[PDB]
């Protein structure tokens, strides 16, 4: 309350504001650093949020508005405002990184945070200094750290944009803010805002599929961003959204490039062509009224063809497409509401049908051709993710149980696996780590019984794939095989499509009573 009044005052002070501009910032930074000291020797992460909102964001916004005076050129404009920016930015960066260094200097976070985190932050190295994973204060410390990493990320993104001459950005231009954001996501994956800011980076490089995916992750994490759905909608649902208009331009560029079959083109088709398909289900009106509207069947056929023919070098993007799509079904429900009409039930059903069409295509043309592949985790990881999703939602389970194509596909896969009770393990796999706090799979992939992990040592490292007991790629593949056979058998137990275990063959066959 009284704290809120103080930061509003910082904002108003800076709005009124060569040298005295830096002076004002220094004074405000000095007070904030002092609040943070009093907080750390529940206020901490709140102090940092009010800092971003009332002090830093309004500054960065002004540089944006001004930069956009340049592009609509102003050479004398670019370097001049880039000069005053470089007077201010090191202070902003210091406010957040000081807090990190402060935090890591007082307390041991190894009970809550991966051990190599200090290393990654170039932070150098008592019994009571070790924070227990359940105290309120321990949570406040980690959240404070996450905020520092988050706002360093945003600041870095803003700088890169100003430091750029054109609105053309190569892939690795945002490498530095992406690293900070990656670390922020790692230590508290529940926070949607980290994914949101990552997606904003990808909008600059025009990786709109990566952007959509990050926007979906930001809307569906256990603590989602409020800007998650607005940005998703700006990209896929708003005829007048700047992101949407850009998407259409990208689809233009791809249209004229479809004849080329360089990997880079196959990859971009898989990143982009799923977008209009998802768009048309969630935002049907928007995707009936544009220049690409009559190309919807084309997008799907080419997407599916690229997946069948070109999955080997592009499997990582196919994996992303799967999660985006699963997430998009819940985007659909949040955006279009609880189904009520006969028509709204059928629209929702049509989307689910398309989703399972994608599943069976993945299973039939990709995973079935790669279930022995011990080198790439993605093949069997995709099967785990489908099953974990399906077991998480009654409506989805019922659709899946009654889907003949999907049940047939799982029978074929399960039978191949059988030809190769509940499994356990000592650490998280790649796909586990990626989907931590993802809502549609209920925040953790629950096909394994990770019950005992909590009683094991080095738990934070275990939950980011690091342990003394790391298995070979082969062993990890074997572990996925077991959990898939187990989940698939549980799923098939009550399927409604006539599939049953032939107890002589010990394989699944199709049956009927007559």
């Amino acid at each position: 309350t009284d704290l809120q009044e103080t930061f509003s005052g910082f904002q108003k002070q800076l709005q009124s504001v060569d040298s005295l501009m830096k002076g004002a910032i220094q004074m405000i930074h000095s007070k904030i650093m002092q609040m943070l000291l009093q907080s750390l020797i529940s206020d901490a992460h709140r102090i940092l949020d009010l800092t971003w909102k009332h002090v830093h964001y309004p500054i960065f916004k002004y540089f944006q508005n001004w930069r956009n005076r340049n592009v609509a050129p102003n050479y004398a404009g670019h370097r001049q405002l880039n000069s005053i920016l470089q007077k201010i930015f090191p202070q902003i960066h210091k406010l957040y990184y000081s807090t990190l260094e402060l935090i890591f200097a007082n307390y041991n976070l190894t009970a809550l945070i991966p051990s190599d985190t200090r290393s990654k932050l170039n932070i150098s190295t008592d019994a009571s200094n070790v924070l227990k994973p359940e105290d309120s204060f321990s949570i406040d410390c980690v959240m404070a750290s996450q905020r520092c990493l988050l706002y360093i990320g945003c600041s870095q993104r803003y700088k890169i944009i100003m430091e750029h001459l054109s609105d053309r950005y190569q892939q690795a231009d945002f490498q530095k803010p992406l690293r900070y954001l990656d670390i922020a996501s790692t230590i508290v994956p529940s926070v949607g805002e980290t994914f949101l800011q990552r997606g904003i980076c990808y909008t600059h490089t025009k990786n709109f599929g990566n952007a959509a995916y990050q926007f979906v992750r930001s809307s569906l994490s256990r603590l989602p961003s409020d800007a998650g759905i607005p940005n998703f909608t700006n990209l896929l649902g708003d005829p007048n959204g700047s992101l949407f208009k850009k998407l259409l331009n990208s689809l233009d560029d791809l249209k004229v490039q479809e004849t080329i079959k360089k990997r880079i083109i196959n990859m971009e088709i898989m990143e982009f062509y799923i977008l209009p398909l998802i768009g048309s289900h969630i935002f049907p009106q928007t995707w009936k009224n544009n220049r690409h509207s009559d190309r919807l069947k084309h997008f799907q056929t080419l997407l599916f063809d690229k997946i069948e023919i070109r999955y080997i070098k592009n499997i990582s993007m196919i994996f992303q497409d799967l999660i985006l799509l699963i997430g998009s079904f819940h985007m659909y429900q949040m955006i279009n509401g609880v189904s009520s009409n006969i028509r709204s039930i059928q629209s929702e059903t049509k989307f689910l049908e398309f989703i399972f069409k994608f599943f069976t295509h993945l299973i039939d043309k990709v995973i079935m051709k790669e279930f022995k592949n011990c080198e790439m985790f993605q093949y069997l990881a995709m099967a785990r993710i489908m099953m974990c999703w399906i077991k998480s939602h009654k409506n989805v389970l019922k659709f899946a149980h009654r889907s003949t194509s999907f049940c047939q596909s799982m029978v074929n896969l399960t039978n191949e696996l059988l030809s190769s009770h509940r499994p356990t393990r000592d650490y998280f796999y790649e796909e586990d780590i990626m989907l931590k706090e993802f809502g549609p799979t209920k925040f953790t992939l629950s096909d394994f019984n990770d019950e005992k992990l909590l009683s094991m040592d080095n738990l934070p490292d275990r939950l980011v794939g690091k342990s003394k007991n790391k298995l070979t790629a082969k062993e990890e593949h074997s572990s996925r095989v077991q959990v898939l056979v187990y989940s698939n058998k549980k799923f098939l137990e009550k399927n409604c499509c006539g599939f049953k275990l032939d107890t002589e063959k010990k394989r699944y066959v199709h049956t009927a009573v007559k």
Binding site: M143, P189, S190, R222, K394, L454, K490
Partner: peptide, 17 residues
């Protein structure tokens, strides 16, 4: 009431709950 950190501690294919 709500802990933002990842907690490993808390259906398996039954249509009936």
């Amino acid at each position: 009431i709500v802990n933002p950190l990842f907690q490993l501690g808390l259906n398996e294919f039954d249509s009936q709950t």
